[PDB]
Design a protein around this ligand. Structure first.
Ligand SMILES: Nc1ncnc2c1ncn2[C@@H]1O[C@H](COP(=O)(O)OP(=O)(O)OP(=O)(O)O)[C@@H](O)[C@H]1O
Ligand SMILES: Nc1ncnc2c1ncn2[C@@H]1O[C@H](COP(=O)(O)OP(=O)(O)O)[C@@H](O)[C@H]1O
Lengths: 364, 314, 284, 52, 52, 157, 73
């Protein structure tokens, strides 16, 4: 999606809704913004919604929209700081309306809803305004039904949508509806009955760590605290192939971390668990604005596949000399055509992966 | 936004805010008092007069005694007035404080209205008021209105929609805190969270951008060290920690700075401080260049050289 | 708890204070056996100097090989270092004063030669850098002169070779049980004991050999058993302040217990508070 | 000894210079590549905001 | 034979070393320029599309 | 109580239960479920062909979007069924899907009541409904009234 | 169960010369073999004090357990 790790952690497919917890004033709207890179690039069917919106954020946002190459690849209607608590509740209802003209079109429908709390306490100042006893937080517990009815829709492409669009003039065909959740709270509080039951409905749950981008590491998110059920099934044969070691350093690096707990406790082996754990930790990054190549999929599979575990081990040479391997692509990136074309594990490539690593010697 | 309850220097920090405010002032603007200590308005107003300042600036004055109808009342006056200025003066600018008065007033009103108070008592929908006004304000084609304001942080209650909801509308967040007060820093406030949205590493360069990232770390660094240092004492540490805490006391102290307005609160004025120097010494302690200057010299520091002039003397 | 935290936590602080209390005790028996043992090594070195003079009045009329110790190129140095932990900070006391003395030799600018014993200052002067021709480490509690042999004739070359004129000799000790003497010496001085070398050996001791041999090897004996005593006292200091620090760390956690007493007690009151709050609220 | 170390030396340093040259070839090679890129990009931009 | 061989290998080695050292340094320069150039082209497109 | 994560061959072993409860056991082997993934339920029809033995148990499904009463409904009619099988002497043994759906289900229930519900608003008598529940399932006189006990994990509470 | 953390109002009040008198020294001694075990791990070398106590109290401690369906004469 714009992080190599974006896919890497949890690939997916149409029909899916995964929660990603989010961080205030951390970018987790601007990170949440940083998402769309591949999407505008995707030029594929998606939607997004916002309520109570901020005209500045609106404006500059649009600036990005043009900045976003597509800007037309998907549409959104807009609802501002005066959008009715009613209307707040309304937009989630709204999307399906012509969203069919993808899902029913058998096209992937896809959506994004955010600030759902606005719909909730919308139903609160509603409910207290209704002088009606609501659930806790003065809003009725409909969120179950409200997000039963609401949360139901996501339909992965399937042809018992046999009437979808033309009914079925086939259109006998596969209604695809991929759901885009937005999960954030101050502290990210799950005790919300909303975050409780809602949390349950999630076909994925991603915790975002304020820590990385907090101490500044541009990608901030909380891995493995981030847990999505779809996963690298959608990681293609190589992506399927090479995707393994993640939780490892999540263990290992962090496992390596544990050694510090006793001052001066480390072992050369463990030292290698901070070489892979901590040094391979030094490997990964995703920017404030990060696209992801997925021909970068190869770029990933290098470190193990190439000697890039060792090769250019210096973060100086990792960032630097690796970028100089992006040069070696400048030098030699003929076949990547056939690669991103391919997107799958074939050792035949893997030869070109080793000799690639030779070009990496050439690429330093 | 300016957080902090009163007593925080929410105003007293706001004093130097008036100093450098004036330093940069140079505009067509007006301001007025609300829920304010009376003679504060008296003689302060007499500083405007002393400054002869009321020229561009009419002032309504609210007092701590005021009516709630008065408190929230002065609002729509802000409305119609801004309608006058920002349009009229395409320059419109103001600063304000202590709105937790007003917001709170709405809260009490709700049940007082017989309206369902909001959850835990506020005006049931009062955020409607919030983004209603935050809505209702713009630096306009009609005219650009620069402004800033405070509200009593609800005894610094964050989840207080005063602070909680507040985080929404504001471009850059601020806190007048017991922290640097607990630190005794001349600021006596909490920045560390505050976000300058305008800081782009493009814009900042990595002069400001990079230096900043190093802040995020070193923050986490000595910050982290607090834990086990607390545990065993700091003995167990690799010395490099002591390098961090070194630049912590030192450089952190260096942030504490002479500021001219100090003269009032801190009988001595401090010093205006230019940013290029901030990159400069930013390198220096970044280099730990001097490394000799006490954190003390760094504490309430003048500029790098001024704190290095210290470093000679101090 | 506290809320879920301050008590689970504070209890961890119980595990703490408890743990380090068992530390105070462990490192206590450690201290007692530590000095108690640490006192042993004097006897035959004492003899050695004693007689050494005793003859050495009349006997001193012959020759002193090591009266220079090593000849002047280096003023040598010596390192002992930690095989364990919790004792104390003579890494700072001794290693500090040590680095200091090093500066004094740079002031001299003459050469200097150090040898690591023990693991730590093997890793200090490793870290801190320096010249250790031999590095010994971490014999544990057992001072052994024969263990010292490899080191003994390790140094005995250059000194004997006259390389390192004087030397530096640093040994911790427990100055009291309380007072712990980190010591550092100018080694490879002529140790120069003329004391009983005042009174001509009044018992005219038929000498099977000539003296100077026993000067070399026997001297090694005197200063060596001296070393066993000195490092032993280093252990006295060691397990002493070990027990000490052990106790203080056993202490620290109480204040925390107080704070968590404010999260479980204060946030206890708070829990009560919300209990009232929604008790009323749902209770309407 | 002489024969070996000699051959190794000459081949070694010869290889050295060759390598350096290669690095240069890649250097202004991919670097020049970068410059041209700069130009084309420029064109695309002028087009874009013109379209605006 | 011996000392000779030692110096010969050691040398041709080191020569290679600095050789590549420079080579990479220069390559880094061609990069540095073509970067700066790239920046320039950027500035150009900027102005053009703009006044356009 | 059934605690286990994944890769059960629960459908496989279910075929062993076909090979047992249908085969190596005679007693009428019934089962039911609710709240699944749509074409993955259809894929449990695929599996229903995998065992192929689906004939032992009527296909009755919830599809969790089913409202709270809808979600919580099917059971007692299930007792109108074991009112055959166990009652039919062909011992009722029916596989039991979802507790979290049921636990939370009774939660949404007593919530809808607005009543003083169970703690955290759950169904106050949901447990008493368990007394009625095991009260239903017994190796019976009639036929053993048996049930496969596996829980939609009430958050794996 | 919790050993004397269970605290009955009555207790050996009903206990007899053998029971009250002869059977007395239990719970505190229990706390011993407990407490005697206590330090052993971190600070070690419990003498035949705790050995001959904690273990003696661990041995007798072993003699304590009375299985379900066990009455006592
Ligand atoms: N991947 C990232 N790495 C570093 N910084 C990021 C990233 N994504 C966004 N940001 C930063 O976050 C800042 C904007 O904060 P923003 O308000 O979006 O925070 P937030 O996390 O979105 O809060 P919320 O999610 O509640 O809106 C921007 O300056 C942007 O640089
Ligand atoms: N920059 C500063 N220097 C010194 N004192 C400060 C500063 N900022 C705030 N204070 C302290 O805050 C205290 C409260 O002053 P006031 O402005 O009334 O606080 P608040 O605005 O929070 O009521 C003052 O006594 C002042 O000493």
């Amino acid at each position: 999606t714009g992080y190599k790790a974006v896919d890497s952690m949890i690939p997916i497919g149409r029909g899916q809704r995964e929660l990603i917890i989010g961080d205030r004033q951390t970018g987790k709207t601007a990170l949440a913004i940083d998402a769309i890179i591949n999407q505008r690039d995707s030029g594929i069917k998606a939607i997004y919604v916002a309520i109570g919106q901020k005209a500045s954020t609106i404006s500059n946002v649009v600036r990005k929209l043009e900045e976003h190459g597509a800007l037309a690849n998907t549409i959104v209607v807009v609802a501002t700081a005066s959008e009715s608590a009613a209307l707040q509740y309304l937009a989630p209802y709204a999307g399906a309306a012509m969203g069919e003209y993808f899902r029913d079109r058998g096209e992937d429908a896809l959506i994004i809803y955010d600030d759902l709390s606005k719909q909730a306490v919308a139903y609160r100042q509603i409910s207290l305004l209704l002088r009606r006893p609501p659930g806790r937080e003065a809003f009725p517990g409909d969120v179950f039904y409200l997000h039963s009815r609401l949360l139901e829709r996501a339909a992965r492409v399937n042809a018992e949508y046999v009437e979808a669009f033309t009914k079925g003039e086939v259109k006998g065909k596969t209604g695809s509806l991929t759901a885009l959740p937005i999960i954030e709270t101050q502290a990210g509080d799950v005790s919300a009955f909303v975050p409780t039951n809602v949390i349950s409905i999630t076909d994925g749950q991603i915790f975002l760590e304020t820590n990385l981008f907090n101490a500044g590491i541009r990608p901030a998110v909380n891995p493995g605290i981030s847990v999505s059920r779809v996963g690298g099934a959608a990681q293609t044969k190589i992506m399927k192939k090479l995707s393994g070691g993640i939780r490892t350093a999540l263990a290992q690096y962090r496992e390596l971390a544990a050694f510090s707990q006793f001052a001066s406790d480390l072992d050369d082996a463990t030292r290698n668990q901070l070489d892979h754990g901590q040094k391979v930790t030094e490997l990964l990054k995703q920017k404030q604005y990060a696209p992801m190549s997925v021909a970068q999929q190869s770029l990933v599979l290098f470190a193990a596949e190439r000697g890039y575990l060792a090769d250019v081990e210096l973060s100086k040479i990792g960032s630097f000399e690796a970028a100089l391997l992006a040069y070696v692509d400048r030098d030699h990136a003929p076949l990547m055509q056939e690669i991103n074309q391919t997107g799958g594990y074939n050792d035949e490539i893997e030869g070109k992966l080793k000799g690639i690593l030779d070009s990496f010697k050439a690429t330093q | 936004g300016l957080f902090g309850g009163a007593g925080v220097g929410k105003t007293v920090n706001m004093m130097e805010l008036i100093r450098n405010i004036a330093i940069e002032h140079s505009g067509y603007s007006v301001f007025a008092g609300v829920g304010e200590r009376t003679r504060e308005g008296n003689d302060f107003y007499h500083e405007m007069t002393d400054s002869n300042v009321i020229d561009k600036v009419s002032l309504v004055y609210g007092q701590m005694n005021e009516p709630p109808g008065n408190r929230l009342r002065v609002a729509l006056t802000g409305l119609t007035m801004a309608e006058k200025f920002r349009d009229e003066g395409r320059d419109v600018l103001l600063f304000v404080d202590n709105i937790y008065r007003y917001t709170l007033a709405g809260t009490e009103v709700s049940a007082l209205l017989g309206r369902m108070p909001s959850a835990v008592g506020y005006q049931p929908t009062l955020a409607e008021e919030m983004g209603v006004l935050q809505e209702r304000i713009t630096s306009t084609k009609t005219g650009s209105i620069t402004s800033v304001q405070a509200v009593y942080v609800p005894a610094d209650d964050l989840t207080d929609p005063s602070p909680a909801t507040t985080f929404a509308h504001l471009d850059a967040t601020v806190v007048l805190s017991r922290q640097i007060a607990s630190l005794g820093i001349y600021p006596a406030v909490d920045p560390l969270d505050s976000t300058s949205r305008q800081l782009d590493p493009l814009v900042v360069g990595q002069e400001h951008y990079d230096t900043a990232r190093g802040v995020q770390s070193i923050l986490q660094r000595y910050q982290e060290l607090k834990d086990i240092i607390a545990i065993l004492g700091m003995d167990e540490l690799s010395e490099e920690d002591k390098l961090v805490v070194a630049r912590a006391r030192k450089i952190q102290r260096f942030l504490s700075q002479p500021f001219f307005v100090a003269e009032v609160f801190t009988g001595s004025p401090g010093k205006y401080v230019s940013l290029k120097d901030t990159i400069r010494g930013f390198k220096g302690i970044m280099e730990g260049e001097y490394d000799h200057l006490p954190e003390q010299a760094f504490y309430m520091v003048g500029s790098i050289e001024e704190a290095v002039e210290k470093a000679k003397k101090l | 708890a506290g809320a879920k935290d301050i008590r689970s936590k504070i209890a961890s602080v119980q595990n703490t204070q408890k743990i380090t209390k068992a530390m105070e005790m462990v490192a206590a028996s450690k201290m007692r056996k530590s000095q108690d043992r640490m006192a042993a090594s004097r006897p035959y070195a004492e003899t050695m100097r004693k007689v050494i003079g005793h003859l050495a009045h009349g006997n001193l009329e012959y020759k002193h090989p090591y009266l220079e110790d090593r000849d002047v190129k280096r003023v040598g140095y010596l390192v002992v270092s930690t095989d364990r932990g919790l004792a104390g900070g003579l890494n700072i006391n001794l290693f500090k004063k040590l680095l200091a003395e090093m500066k004094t030799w740079t002031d001299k600018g003459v050469q200097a030669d150090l040898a690591m014993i023990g693991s730590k200052g093997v890793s200090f002067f490793n870290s801190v850098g320096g010249n250790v021709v031999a590095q010994v480490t971490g014999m544990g509690d057992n001072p052994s002169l024969s263990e010292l042999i490899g080191p003994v004739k390790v140094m005995l070359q250059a000194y004997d070779e006259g390389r390192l004129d004087k030397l530096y000799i640093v040994s911790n000790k427990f100055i009291n049980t309380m007072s712990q003497v980190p010591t550092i010496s100018q080694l490879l001085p002529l140790p120069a004991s003329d004391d009983d070398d005042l009174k001509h050996k009044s018992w005219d001791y038929l000498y099977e050999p000539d003296p100077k041999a026993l000067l070399d090897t026997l001297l090694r004996r005197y200063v060596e058993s001296q070393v066993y005593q000195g490092v032993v006292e280093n252990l006295a200091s060691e397990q002493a302040a070990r027990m000490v620090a052990m106790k203080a760390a056993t202490d620290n956690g109480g204040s925390l217990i107080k704070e968590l007493q404010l999260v479980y007690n204060k946030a206890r009151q708070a829990s009560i508070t919300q209990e009232l709050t929604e008790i009323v609220s749902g209770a309407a | 000894l002489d024969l070996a170390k000699a051959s190794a030396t000459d081949q070694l340093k010869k290889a050295k210079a060759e390598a350096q040259v290669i690095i240069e070839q890649a250097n202004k090679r991919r670097s020049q590549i970068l410059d041209e890129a700069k130009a084309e990009a420029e064109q695309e931009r002028t087009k874009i905001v013109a379209q605006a």
